[PDB]
Design a protein around this motif. Sequence first.
Motif: not given
Lengths: 239, 239, 239, 239
Positions: A219-224, B215-229
């Motif tokens: 999920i996370v890699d498909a969406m970076a 698991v939800v935190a692992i996904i959503v938090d990993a991707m506020a980072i890509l959403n701020q980078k």
Amino acid sequence: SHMYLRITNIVESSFFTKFIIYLIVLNGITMGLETSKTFMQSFGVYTTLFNQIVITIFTIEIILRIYVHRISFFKDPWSLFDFFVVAISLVPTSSGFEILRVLRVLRLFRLVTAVPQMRKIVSALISTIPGMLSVIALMTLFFYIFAIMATQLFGERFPEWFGTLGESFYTLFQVMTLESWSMGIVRPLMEVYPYAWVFFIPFIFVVTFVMINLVVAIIVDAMAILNQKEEQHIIDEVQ
Amino acid sequence: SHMYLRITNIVESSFFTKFIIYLIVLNGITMGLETSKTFMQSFGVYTTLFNQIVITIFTIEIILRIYVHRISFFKDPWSLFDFFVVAISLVPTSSGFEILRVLRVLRLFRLVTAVPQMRKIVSALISTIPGMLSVIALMTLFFYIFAIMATQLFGERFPEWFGTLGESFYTLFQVMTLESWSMGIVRPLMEVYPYAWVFFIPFIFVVTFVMINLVVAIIVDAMAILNQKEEQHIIDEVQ
Amino acid sequence: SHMYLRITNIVESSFFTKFIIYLIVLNGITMGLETSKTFMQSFGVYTTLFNQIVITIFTIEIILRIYVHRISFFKDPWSLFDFFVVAISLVPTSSGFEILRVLRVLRLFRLVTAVPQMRKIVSALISTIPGMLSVIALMTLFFYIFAIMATQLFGERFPEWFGTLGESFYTLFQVMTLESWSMGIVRPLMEVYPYAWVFFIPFIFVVTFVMINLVVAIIVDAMAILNQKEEQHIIDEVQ
Amino acid sequence: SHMYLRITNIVESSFFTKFIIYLIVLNGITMGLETSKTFMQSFGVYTTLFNQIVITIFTIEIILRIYVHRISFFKDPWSLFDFFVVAISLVPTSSGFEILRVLRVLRLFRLVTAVPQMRKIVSALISTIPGMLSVIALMTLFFYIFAIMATQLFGERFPEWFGTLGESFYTLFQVMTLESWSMGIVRPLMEVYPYAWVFFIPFIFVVTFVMINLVVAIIVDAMAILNQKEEQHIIDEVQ
Ligand SMILES: CCCCCCCCCCCCCC(=O)OC[C@H](COP(=O)(O)OCC[N+](C)(C)C)OC(=O)CCCCCCCCCCCCC
Ligand SMILES: CCCCCCCCCCCCCC(=O)OC[C@H](COP(=O)(O)OCC[N+](C)(C)C)OC(=O)CCCCCCCCCCCCC
Ligand SMILES: CCCCCCCCCCCCCC(=O)OC[C@H](COP(=O)(O)OCC[N+](C)(C)C)OC(=O)CCCCCCCCCCCCC
Ligand SMILES: CCCCCCCCCCCCCC(=O)OC[C@H](COP(=O)(O)OCC[N+](C)(C)C)OC(=O)CCCCCCCCCCCCC
């Protein structure tokens, strides 16, 4: 050409695929009724005939498709599949391997290769497998190492579950699914080897923690990617 | 130096790692055949020799790697692991602990530390553990509190499952996996303590609701980072 | 004030919380050893004393905290919790309800309310519950409707599983967890009511399809927010 | 109009829906007590009356709603549902099909169609089904093909599980849930057909790998949309 292009317009036509998709569904209902022995006592030979018909129609369809598509037919997975599931359907019922008479049914999967809606899904699902092959390898090695260990620790007093590397492979896969892992396996194991929990609780931890991260990465890699294909189309316009 | 740099060019060479990766796979097939007693009756001593060979080759490889890498070898986890799984492989079979003869197989995990494709995955999977340690602590405390309670409530009439804090730990972990939690545990419990469901249904709720949010935190938090980078590289260009 | 502010500097001090966090862990190890009857035969009264000590120290700590914090103490959930788990710990062991002697252990959850690292997690996990209350209601109604239906369909020939609305509630929750839903419940049911699968296979479908969408919404909705809090900080700078 | 608009202001009023939502909850508690035979021996006819009352009140409510809403009532799913769950409630108890007396309870689902908070959720959950219909078809075909194969391979020595296409459908669904798939099904199967694992382990792999990708696609695809609806509102302002 002349005879080539005459064939090609038929093979590439909508009626041709429609007629195959038609026959596929017709044979699909045939094989489902073929399970009922009430039906096979009554309308029995009707379907062995109708099966033998569709098999040759499919061979003709494959032969025509090979003449049209040339080398590209044997480089197309959907065609290669259609080839093999009809080739399986051609080996006669007479053999010391009656399982090939059951593999006949895989010719119902043609409805995937024939209907482009299904192919799109099947291609999307398979398209995740490439990146997973690396994680699949780590898990398969992990399994192999523990299956060696489990066979040596438990296969003596517990042959059915662990007396052989293959059985320990199966049993460990059952532990991965958590199917009766405790009441059915580890708890009986602990009646003889009290520290067997030291083996399986970590095995359940690693196996699960990988499966989760496998999905999370999907999920996370498909969406970076979508977060950089957008990061690009935004810098596009400010320059 | 002179003899140092002569060793270093060998240790750091592609052939060296290739030769180790080679031996690892060779020993891997050896240990799998070593499970079959048909093979051990026939080609038996062939593999005890070939095992004793690889162990010393690995000790040499570790010795050479220590001389090259100096303090950095004992600060590298992949090296520290390679050290320990060969050190385990060195303790002789003679002991009142024959389990170390089974821990020999962990030297097959060298194929992870030796193949950089696997190390990249293993590093990615482990890299999620750091943030989870805080949630892992809450769950481990949650388990400890309920394992005390379950031992006191049920360990009297149900010693196998709850008669000891360690057993209640194991049983509660089995309830977390949902493995026979009702038919095998709670339903027999309720035949004596009718309100045992008041204990376990919430336990299943909390334990599950945490695992999901983990698991939800692992996904959503990993991707506020890509959403701020990305939120940064876009403000980069408009200034 | 004078005596007030003298107390406040103690209560709000690092030593105070450290001393409580200290006592909490000390009592935590006490309760775990209290399970062993070998230990209770030996060091038995040592811990009943040490328990009675910590209970009053905690009452003092709560009393002091109430004088400092005034109405805000009884509007703080962590304080309200600390109040109740010590109030539970105060009701004497003499009663026709010895379960309160087991609820003593909930005072180990103080290590959550006392350590701000844990509070942050517990607050994050609880913070998902608010939006889920609406979906939780639909599921609870769904359960209630089917628990009525299951009690009426199956509770006659199957009292243990369905003979009462409460039992059908429990059994349906077991079907939600998929714990022995087929081999243990539906397959025996079908030996009498052949169409029981028409009841449970849809129940498994709805219950699962909601649980999945509950998690999916938790992820996708949490991250349209980060995708608009970024959509805002980017329009910020181009104006 | 005159009599039409007089009715419309009542039907569309807050009191009307409030009164229905009121009666729904009242009947909901009625049906739950109706399970207890202690209550039915005492307050028995009280609820058969009160049920017969609400059914006609609901018929009146549906009749009024049809006159107001005209063709739009029979094009509204929530109305069409309310129609059918009261139409079911109207067929008298006298029949050789006493199951319709149990389908009475579906009129408790009116609390969904009547409370707009629930409708919003139910609409959100159903809104994922449209795209899944294509993947649902592939799985349903996959099941049908293997259910044919399993009936032919195992239905002979194992009629209960596989002796019929319908049973193999049920059993394969049980294997999908992993409910006793090994200890209960495949392991007994392997006592007769040793290679049955070649059938089910792949079946578990495909079935699971699709379910995961189904959820992953639901998330990642839903959020390339929010990642382009943002990619649009950012290019909006730089032009
Ligand atoms: C290539 C794509 C093709 C798609 C085709 C889809 C439709 C296929 C329909 C096949 C129907 C087969 C029915 C059948 O064989 O029924 C077998 C059994 C009855 O066995 P039988 O021995 O006749 O019972 C005797 C009863 N007695 C003693 C009273 C005389 O009864 C049963 O097993 C019950 C009926 C089971 C029906 C299962 C339908 C599955 C549909 C899957 C659709 C997939 C679409 C992609
Ligand atoms: C460090 C990385 C190394 C990777 C190496 C990968 C390949 C390893 C191959 C090992 C093959 C071992 C075969 C073996 O021991 O078979 C044991 C049993 C047969 O036991 P046995 O007692 O010989 O049977 C006697 C039969 N009788 C009565 C008729 C005389 O038969 C079985 O258990 C069935 C065969 C099971 C094969 C399982 C293969 C797993 C492959 C995992 C690959 C992981 C790659 C990372
Ligand atoms: C508020 C936070 C406080 C955190 C405190 C963490 C540490 C707590 C340690 C408690 C240790 C309790 C040990 C204990 O009671 O052991 C009970 C049993 C042995 O029972 P016992 O009847 O003595 O065995 C007699 C043996 N015989 C016949 C040969 C004489 O043996 C067992 O049950 C095996 C040992 C189980 C240890 C489980 C440890 C769980 C650690 C959880 C850490 C959570 C951190 C947040
Ligand atoms: C349309 C929406 C309506 C929402 C209404 C929500 C509230 C409904 C309350 C219904 C209460 C029904 C209680 C009931 O029938 O209890 C049945 C059994 C007792 O059976 P009974 O045969 O009386 O026991 C005899 C005992 N004896 C031998 C000592 C004389 O005892 C039990 O089964 C235990 C009590 C179970 C209560 C379950 C409550 C579930 C609440 C679900 C809320 C959903 C909200 C959306």
